[PDB]
Amino acid sequence: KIKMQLLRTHPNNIKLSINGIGKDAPTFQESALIADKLLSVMKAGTYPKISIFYNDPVSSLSFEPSEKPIFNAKTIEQSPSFGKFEIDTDANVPRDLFEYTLANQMLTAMAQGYAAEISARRNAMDNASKNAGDMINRYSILYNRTRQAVITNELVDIITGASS
């Protein structure tokens, strides 16, 4: 669904897209694999930033679309406090941490989005039912008016007959 809306606005910009996710609730397997493909296919570490958009479920009556930036390995490198998070050259923490937070941030984003989506679905479908009720009632009045009119012509028919 989000593929369709963006695909209209820019189709070239769509380079890699992912389908067959939406059915299930967010899961690590999915996030990890999507991340893995994102790294391999799009080489996203060389992209100046990453930004992910999702739907923050502001309240369980609302959803505000929100985004956050996935901090790349360069960011981790050049963050000043990192010595008060001491680690050795060996087992270079940026090169694991980037990838690890690619999934962790993505999975969390996914969870927030899906939670907003299903919540909204309940809300919307409820409002739909209400809107349908109003339309039911509007056609009911028309039905009643039409029903009444049939009666009137029939009564006239009986009288017209009787008079003869």
Binding site: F82, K84, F85, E86, I87, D96, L97, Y100, L107, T108
Partner: protein, 120 residues
């Protein structure tokens, strides 16, 4: 303090001593410990809160003693002991499947995990 958490359940979000296996071998954290990041190697973990000791099997992750003495442990899923011989037999099958080459590497991680489990 410990803040063991997963995107599944929050385990141990003071937890006096925690013993962890990291790519730096094994690391133990006690009360005020210096604030580090350590990538957690896939692990057999002991968590002690006072004298009581609880025994996680952990999918590897990240450990971060924060300077507010909060040991943020982040891992996908983790005690291990209730899960526990057919897994070692099927792991031997996965080792034979390591004949098939990423699939070999996957199967190798599986063999590593069996060895790590089998120790307990």
């Amino acid at each position: 303090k410990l803040q063991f958490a997963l995107p599944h359940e929050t385990l141990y979000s003071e937890v006096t001593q925690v013993n962890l296996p990291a790519k730096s071998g094994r690391i133990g954290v006690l009360a005020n410990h210096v604030p580090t990041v350590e990538q957690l190697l896939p692990g057999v973990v002991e968590v002690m809160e006072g004298s009581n000791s609880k025994k996680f099997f952990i999918s590897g992750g990240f450990a971060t003693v924060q300077p507010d003495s909060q040991l943020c442990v982040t891992a996908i899923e983790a005690p291990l002991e209730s899960f526990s011989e057919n897994i070692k037999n099927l792991l031997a099958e996965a080792k034979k499947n390591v004949s098939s080459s990423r699939e070999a590497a996957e199967a190798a991680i599986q063999v590593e995990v069996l060895e790590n489990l089998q120790s307990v």
